[PDB]
Design a protein around this ligand. Sequence first.
Ligand SMILES: COC(=O)c1c(O)cc(O)c(Cl)c1CCc1nccn1Cc1ccccc1
Length: 210
Amino acid sequence: EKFAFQAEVNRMMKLIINSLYKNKEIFLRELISNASDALDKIRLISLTDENALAGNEELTVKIKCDKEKNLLHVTDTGVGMTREELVKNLGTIAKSGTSQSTSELIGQFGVGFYSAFLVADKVIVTSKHNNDTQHIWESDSNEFSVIADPRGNTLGRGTTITLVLKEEASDYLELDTIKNLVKKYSQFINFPIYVWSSKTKTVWDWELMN
Ligand SMILES: COC(=O)c1c(O)cc(O)c(Cl)c1CCc1nccn1Cc1ccccc1
């Protein structure tokens, strides 16, 4: 009743996504692919301005697990997003407590966003664009809320996708499962992709997978 349109969009996107790919791991491929497109965008801007990477001279994809908090982080130093981009997000999500340009948004980012809800219950976006403030955005595919980050500009430039995982999909947080999965969907990415892994007396560091 409250979110009839949102639930129907969620039902249709899940139905079509599950039918087309049949592999629930498509969420990780989208996270890798979308991060690559953001990195490619800012690298293209670099070829015309000398100091377009001043906020962050690296162009990486860094994936980190949090088995205790049940979190999955995929951080890239791509182009990032302004606050107005986060407000539009995909046009199908209503602003919190308030109950085509959006159809073109679903075309480009619908599969990437709604596939995350095959393994997650909430998606949190932390982004920083060159000409704007760092913001935190969250949604449950029904409502959304955007916030100015109290930590300030900690990303320098780029985006962090945080998925709070379902209890059924807690296996994606182990090291050997997330490392083998990233390796599969990385042979077509022209950017280094690191995974926070442990080495042995045990220290943690960025391990590059491609
Ligand atoms: C799902 O996460 C992403 O789509 C995603 C990502 O995974 C890595 C990234 O570096 C970036 Cl920028 C995005 C955002 C890509 C975007 N640009 C413009 C619009 N939207 C879609 C959108 C998705 C969610 C919130 C706001 C915008």
